Symmetry: C5
Subunit: 205 residues, 5 copies
Amino acid sequence: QANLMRLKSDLFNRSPMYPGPTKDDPLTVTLGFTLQDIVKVDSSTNEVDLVYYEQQRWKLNSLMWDPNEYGNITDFRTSAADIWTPDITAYSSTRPVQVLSPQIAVVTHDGSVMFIPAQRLSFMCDPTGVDSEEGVTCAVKFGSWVYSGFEIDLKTDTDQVDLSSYYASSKYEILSATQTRQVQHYSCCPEPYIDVNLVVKFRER
Amino acid sequence: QANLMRLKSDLFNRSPMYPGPTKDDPLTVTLGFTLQDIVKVDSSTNEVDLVYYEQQRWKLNSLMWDPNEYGNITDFRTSAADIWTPDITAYSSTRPVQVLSPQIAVVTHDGSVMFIPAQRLSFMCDPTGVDSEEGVTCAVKFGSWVYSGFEIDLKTDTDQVDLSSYYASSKYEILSATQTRQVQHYSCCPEPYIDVNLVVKFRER
Amino acid sequence: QANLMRLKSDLFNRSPMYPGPTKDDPLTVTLGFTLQDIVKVDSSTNEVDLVYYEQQRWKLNSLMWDPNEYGNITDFRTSAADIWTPDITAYSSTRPVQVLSPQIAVVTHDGSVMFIPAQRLSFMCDPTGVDSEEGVTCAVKFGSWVYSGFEIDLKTDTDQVDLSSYYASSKYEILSATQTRQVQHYSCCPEPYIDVNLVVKFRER
Amino acid sequence: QANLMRLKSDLFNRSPMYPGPTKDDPLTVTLGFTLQDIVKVDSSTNEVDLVYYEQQRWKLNSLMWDPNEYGNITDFRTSAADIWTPDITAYSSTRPVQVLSPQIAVVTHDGSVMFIPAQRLSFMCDPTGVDSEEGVTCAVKFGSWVYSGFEIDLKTDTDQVDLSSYYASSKYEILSATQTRQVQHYSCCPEPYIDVNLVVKFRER
Amino acid sequence: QANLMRLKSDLFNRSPMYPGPTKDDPLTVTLGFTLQDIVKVDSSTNEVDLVYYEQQRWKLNSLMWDPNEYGNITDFRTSAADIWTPDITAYSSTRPVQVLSPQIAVVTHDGSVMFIPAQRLSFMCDPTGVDSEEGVTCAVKFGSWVYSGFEIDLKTDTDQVDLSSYYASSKYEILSATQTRQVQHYSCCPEPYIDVNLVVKFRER
Ligand SMILES: O=C(O[C@H]1C[C@H]2CC[C@@H](C1)N2C[C@H](O)c1ccccc1)c1ccccc1
Ligand SMILES: O=C(O[C@H]1C[C@H]2CC[C@@H](C1)N2C[C@H](O)c1ccccc1)c1ccccc1
Ligand SMILES: O=C(O[C@H]1C[C@H]2CC[C@@H](C1)N2C[C@H](O)c1ccccc1)c1ccccc1
Ligand SMILES: O=C(O[C@H]1C[C@H]2CC[C@@H](C1)N2C[C@H](O)c1ccccc1)c1ccccc1
Ligand SMILES: O=C(O[C@H]1C[C@H]2CC[C@@H](C1)N2C[C@H](O)c1ccccc1)c1ccccc1
Ligand SMILES: [Cl-]
Ligand SMILES: [Cl-]
Ligand SMILES: [Cl-]
Ligand SMILES: [Cl-]
Ligand SMILES: [Cl-]
Ligand SMILES: [Cl-]
Ligand SMILES: [Cl-]
Ligand SMILES: [Cl-]
Ligand SMILES: [Cl-]
Ligand SMILES: [Cl-]
Ligand SMILES: [Cl-]
Ligand SMILES: [Cl-]
């Protein structure tokens, strides 16, 4: 255990704190969604609840090491409190997001980080026509709140949201689920801002 | 990254803590509102829920630097925990305000600070006549709870509320919305207190 | 700002922790109420909700200074976390009190402290006859949970509650509201305990 | 105040942490209940809500002192965070207990500790027949979750629950209320476990 | 008490932090369930609430000692905050789990740890046919969120869930209850992940 304890000590306690991405040192984050369930729809306030888990991937030079020097260690698990994390937020949320999983991430010797947080979200969506055979469609945007496109960029490995873990006896059937990257231009700010737009079509079971 | 790490170290770790504005050395905060949605109205308790995001701007001499000495760095992002923030509160709230965005602010080399917090608020408002063609009007005041006029002052760049991001399929239509500065005298206290009055006119879609 | 930073350093960091009033060092706290609104009444559980703000005043010798020695500073604002505060509680509450304002207090050079906390409270009250012209009356007691009369005493500047900020379009009109000091003798303890009784008479709008 | 500050420093900062009771060195806790109100009964889930305050008494040799050596000080108030406290829990609760009072305890020169916490509790109880003249009866057990009988023992000064502070206009009348000590044997574990069973008989007013 | 204080000091303060299991130093956790009550079923969102307590057992070499050297001490109780704990999570939860018991664990001289946490959980379950004589069946999986099989394995002493403490007057009758170990293979990852599946059969009184 001595080698892992030493590597951790050298990485986090010796060196100073990482101050995030800049225009000179930008980074890209890969996003992915696994939809688990549509728990409820509120027709009187136009609010819809989702249960899912997000995939977050990024790489930093400040986090890499030589495995040979630390007794052939390629990777390790660490609390998300010990490392820098991106600030990915939902634009149309109506209540604070609830966390449903432990906050631990995995770090590999090349500097790659993987973080998989599970959560419940309430957002703006009109459910009129969910009782029909054709169904109703809704969308929600995810992205960094404070950083532009010159500091953080976003990427998706596929445009098909993972439905391999969707609840079979849910009150609502999934007709389509997509994850597409998009660019925005805001009046306030002269820089573009990048997002990933989650679009879902569904109906009553 | 060494230069940004150095600037941050010199600003926050070397010098002591800023003890807030005084009567001798006072400051001014600029406010602005972006209304997103009227989620629900409760006719039985006269309570109304609002989802929006606030614009906060102030300047401090203790936060400025020469970009030339720190490798031509003009600005940076930092956690709101690291810097002093104004104590802006709503006078007619009925439940504690819910935060819906990350707490990160931006600092420029001249000492200017920008902070944009997203939140949900419940306040006192009679909705009688929202079902009419003319609609109903309500208001809520914002300002520093503990600081007087001789300590903190308020300013608005415009009188019109930003409605460019208002939810298109909301159950309620916005007829008018304004942000206007006020100066008040309370019975308790011999000093005046400044606030910004948010007045919204709406009806059923 | 150097003088205020120095005064604060000398008061809180040099000297040791204040261990609360004793029988050889007792203190008196002044109380006062500003009623804002009666939000709801529950006839099925006999519970009533209130929104208001309290006035707290006390003096300590450990907090006084000479303004002349610290560049003519008479007073300053500080987080309630930095100073000792009285343990004032409501005897008939049914749910934990919600805080609705920042926790900042003001300290003057003579050692006087002023703290104004805003809050929402749920307490025991039978609302039978609120629909009548005569209305219904209810009461709630406030005071120190642990400290007796030989450690902490209470005082009120007036016996009339401040109704100058009561919500005009509330579902309930106030007929009368009063604040009066009481001395209680409990079976548990040979010492007496001091409290202030808030009595409100109201009816439907 | 110098003497009290000194005594506190010598007790908590000089000596090491108390590691809780053992087999070779056990202790006894005295319990007592003051019933304030039965707030609501839920016939659809068989859940009942109670508002009350508990009496906790224990003695430790590590907490005693000579008053003569510390300027004739017999007792003092201290935050429950500074001292060891027993882990008394409710076996049939359905939601986490809500605290309704400050967490301060009193310590005397002989080593005796007194702690009086006020709280709201939801537990399993079938209310069928509360509308009858005979009424309905329910019970709930309190005791240490982790320590057996060979480490912690329990005691009651009386078997008659204190009803001198029960809410006069409650929707429910108290017929009888008792506090009795019990010794349990669980299938899992070879040691005996002690508890105090609270039994209440009530009906509609 | 000097010996126990010394043992605790030598174990936690002298040696460095345990960095969690690895492929070179893996461990196994034993699980067990005691079902207490089915509090409510929501047919409109397909959500079910459970109240129970879990059994957790694991062994570490970093936690063993010679009783002879520490005055014949075989075991002791300690706060779960002082030791490493497994990240055992429910896959189909819809709201954050509520804790209903103190967080204390027991450590024996051979390095074995026992932790018994009590909790309330809301998960995905279709209750259609609970009103029938045959009843309805539902399931939920438990296991570590981040560690694979080569780091954490699971075990059960029996396949029958403990029903000796199930609430007699519950609105729902239990007909069956089993705990069974499973091995999952995920696309994302190259190692197999283990879980323990909880299956309950029930109906209305
Ligand atoms: O910088 C600002 O806002 C931040 C940048 C953008 C715009 C609002 C919010 C905060 N950011 C949105 C973010 O890019 C986002 C977009 C879509 C989904 C998630 C996050 C700003 C806006 C108005 C006035 C002054 C400053
Ligand atoms: O300082 C006081 O009041 C504080 C200052 C002002 C007045 C009430 C509240 C607390 N503060 C209001 C603040 O100026 C404000 C106004 C409008 C919207 C938000 C905050 C005070 C109150 C009662 C007795 C003694 C002193
Ligand atoms: O010290 C006790 O309780 C404290 C003293 C009194 C009684 C309850 C509570 C805590 N104190 C009441 C408090 O002074 C108060 C009364 C009314 C409104 C607010 C606070 C006590 C009670 C019963 C048995 C042994 C000790
Ligand atoms: O020690 C255990 O549980 C603790 C001891 C007992 C049994 C459950 C709970 C926790 N304890 C009950 C406790 O004595 C109690 C009883 C009544 C009211 C409060 C606490 C245990 C249970 C099952 C398998 C292995 C170990
Ligand atoms: O490693 C991953 O996720 C972890 C492994 C598995 C799958 C989700 C979660 C985190 N783990 C589930 C866990 O094994 C579990 C299974 C059953 C009950 C509780 C926990 C992952 C998932 C998607 C894309 C890239 C990487
Ligand atoms: Cl709900
Ligand atoms: Cl920003
Ligand atoms: Cl709601
Ligand atoms: Cl409500
Ligand atoms: Cl103030
Ligand atoms: Cl929107
Ligand atoms: Cl007390
Ligand atoms: Cl309620
Ligand atoms: Cl409920
Ligand atoms: Cl145990
Ligand atoms: Cl870990
Ligand atoms: Cl992972």
